[PDB]
Every structure is written in structure tokens, then in C-alpha cells.
Amino acid sequence: MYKLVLIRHGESTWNKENRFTGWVDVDLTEQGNREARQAGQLLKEAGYTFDIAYTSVLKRAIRTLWHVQDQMDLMYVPVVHSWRLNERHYGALSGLNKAETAAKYGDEQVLVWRRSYDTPPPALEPGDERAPYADPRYAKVPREQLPLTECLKDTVARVLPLWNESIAPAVKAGKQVLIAAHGNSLRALIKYLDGISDADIVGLNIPNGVPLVYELDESLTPIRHYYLGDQEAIAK
């Protein structure tokens, strides 16, 4: 049996401001900081440890990991930062207020932008300042693999190679893995691990700052999964 722990980052500045974020590298709020710190304290209190962590190149996730490492006294473990765990790319929606966007385009339209498994939001223009081509985080990613927008299907396709090439081998090698990432990149892993349908996966919401534990068998198939902490509070 193996355990894999996942954690979604806590509140970001743009979560606070109700702005679509995607690949924009916004930071945590004080609240997001404390949620990270509390996840760490939960893991520590439950006696979890980790040999390695995986995170995105986005500091809201990485800072969340840092807080967890700090609270667990695991600041020395190897950390793999991969663009592959990035939040779903929100295209030209990135930075827009979500309430305002709905007002403008209607709930229906925005539903498709938010939830359509296979149809992405409107893309950035290539020359947009938000585009990823000049960003040192992505200097080594082939230009054609860099998104100007993504649907969850794209996000799944981009996440899974990191699982197959690096995380799965880690887990099989006996390493206790923490993955600190984002709502959609975690949704993508969960979709894969639990065989969730294209149809059902857009329904799964993952709470911020709550460790999500997967027990995996020898074939890396889930036996079960659970959140750590206050079940009643979580459920609410």
C-alpha cells in the first residue's frame, strides 16, 4: 500500500478579488498563508512525513508547500517544480472579475468557459503580456507545448506525463510523496487515479488547504482516499 498526499493551495490575492487566475503568478493572502500552515500542522500532528514533494512553478502553490515544509520540519526534502502542475490556463479571461464576466457574457457562456471539459476559454493573443513565451519558468518548454488557453482536457494531457515519468516511479520506489498544486491540476490527477468520467470530473471541487490522502495499491490503483482534519467542517 502506498500513500500519496495532495494539497490544493490556500487563498490567493485573486481568489480574494474573485478574478480568474490561471497561469498568472499571484501570491497567497494572509488567509492562504494560514491555511497552508494549518495543513502542515495537521500532517505533522497525524505523523505524516515526506521524502519528496511536487509542485507547480506558481508561487501560490510553492509558498503553500513552503509553509507545509516549515511546519513539518521538512525544509530539506527534494522538491520538483513543474509547469506541468500549473493551474489550468485561463486564456484572455485571466485577470477578469468573474462576476463581471458573467454579467457581460451571461452565465451560460461562462459555464462553458469554466466547465466544458473539451472547449477552452478564449485564448490570449500571442503578443499579449500575459503570454508565456518570454517567461523564464517556461524557457525550456517547446514553444508549441505552451498554452494560450486550456480546457481541463488539455490540463489532463499536460499533467499526466509528470505522473508517468516522475511521480509514479517515486511512489513505486517507496518515496512518500506530497503534491502541492492547484484545483485543476489536482482534478486532473484525481480523474486519472479514480477513473472519473469526462462528464463527472468537472463536478469535483477540492477544498483549499486540506490534505487529501490517497491509499494506493501495488498497481497504483486507489484503495481509498480521505481528507485529513475536521470532517464536519470539511463537508461544510
User: Per DSSP, which regions of 62-170 are E strands?
Assistant: 79-81
Report the largest interatomic distance among the alpha carbons of the chain, rounded to a whole angstrom.
51
Q: Rounded distance, CA 163 to CA 4, Å? A: 12
Give SS3 for 140: coil
The bridge status of strand 212-216 relative to strand 222-227 is antiparallel
Annotated binding-site residues for (2R)-2,3-bisphosphoglycerate read 8-9, 15, 21-22, 60, 87, 90, 98, 114-115, 182-184
- Asked if residues 28 and 182 have their Cβ atoms less than 8 Å apart, the reply is no
Pairing of strands 79-81, 2-8: unpaired
Residues making up the binding site for (2R)-3-phosphoglycerate: 21-22, 87, 90, 98, 114-115, 184
Sign of the C-alpha dihedral, residues 234, 54, 35, 9? negative
The residues facing 181 across adjacent strands are: 8
Give the start-end residues of each E strand in the chain: 2-8, 52-55, 79-81, 177-181, 212-216, 222-227
DSSP β-bridge partners for residue 222 = 216
Report how far residue 54's alpha carbon sits from residue 49's, in angstroms, rounded to the nearest whole number. 14
**Active-site residues: which are they?**
9, 87
Q: Which of 109, 85, 110, 229 is nearest to 162 (CA)?
A: 85
- Domain regions of the chain by residue span: 1-236
Interatomic CA distance for residues 115 and 212, integer angstroms: 22
Of residues 50, 34, 91, the one with CA closest to residue 180: 50
For domain 1-236, give its CATH number from 3.40.50.1240, 3.20.20.70, 3.90.550.10, 1.10.10.10.
3.40.50.1240
